[PDB]
Amino acid sequence: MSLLRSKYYDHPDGEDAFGKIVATNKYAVSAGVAWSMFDVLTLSKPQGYLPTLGRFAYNTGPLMGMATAFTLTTLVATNARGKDDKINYLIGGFAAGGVFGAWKHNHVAGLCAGLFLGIAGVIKKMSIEQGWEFFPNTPIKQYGGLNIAGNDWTIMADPPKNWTTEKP
């Protein structure tokens, strides 16, 4: 029950700022901490208390830059024009790609990552305006085939039950 326990789409896009920053940086924190936890023990071990936190910051902070730049670019593009659409998410993806290019000192990564994250942004915007869900709850969940009641193969005999289908 705080401002940290907020979602990205709890408000319409462009209405709220700080909750969107906290939410998108929360997914950035989760992804960076998970990747750095499978990084600093497994490949390129730092062998120190301070370079481990340095690798944690190296794998975390640019993802905060990605999240903050994409959310601020989407907020500016939503507050600029009246209509909300997909190319706001596209230019936010290009801003996050520019943040990637500033991370890796390679413009080509910055563009290609901008194009990929813009495609991801327009697909996510199509999801949020068309109503379909990326990972929905499963409607049809087969717990078996036909005759799941009929293939009880047990050698012990069933005692008489205490329940009936007959009305009193």
Ligand X SMILES: CCCCCCCCCCCCCCCCCC(=O)OC[C@H](COP(=O)([O-])OCC[N+](C)(C)C)OC(=O)CCCCCCCCCCCCCCCCC
List interacting residues with ligand 3PE (CB under 6 A).
31, 34-35, 38, 104, 106, 108-109, 112-113, 155-157
Interface region with ligand X, contact rule CB under 6 A, candidates 15-23, 26-34, 47-55, 74-82: 26-34
Judge whether 93 and 120 are in contact, CB under 8 Å. yes
CA distance 23 to 17: 10
31 makes contact with ligand CDL (CB under 6 A): yes
CA distance 14 to 72: 10
Question: Exactly one of 18, 82, 135, 167 binds other proteins (CB under 8 A); which one?
Answer: 135
Q: List binders of ligand CDL among 121-150 (CB under 6 A).
A: 121, 124
Least distance in Å: CB of 117 to ligand X? 8
Q: With CA atoms as reference, report the closest residue to 102 among 61, 49, 146.
A: 61
Look at the alpha carbons of 9, 11, 17, 18 in this order and tell me if their dihedral is positive or negative: negative
CA distance 44 to 26: 26
Q: Coil, strand or helix: which one is 42? A: coil
Quote the crossing angle between the two packed helices 49-80 and 87-104, to the nearest 10°. Answer: 150
152 makes contact with other proteins (CB under 8 A): yes
Least distance in Å: CB of 123 to other proteins? 8
Least distance in Å: CB of 41 to ligand X? 20
CA distance 31 to 42: 17
147 contact, one of ligand X, ligand CDL, ligand 3PE, none, CB 5-8 Å limit per kind: ligand X
Binding positions for ligand CDL, rule: CB under 6 A: 7-9, 23-24, 26-31, 33-34, 66-67, 70, 93, 96, 116-117, 120-121, 124
Binding positions for other proteins, rule: CB under 8 A: 38, 123, 126, 134-149, 151-156, 158-159, 161-163, 165
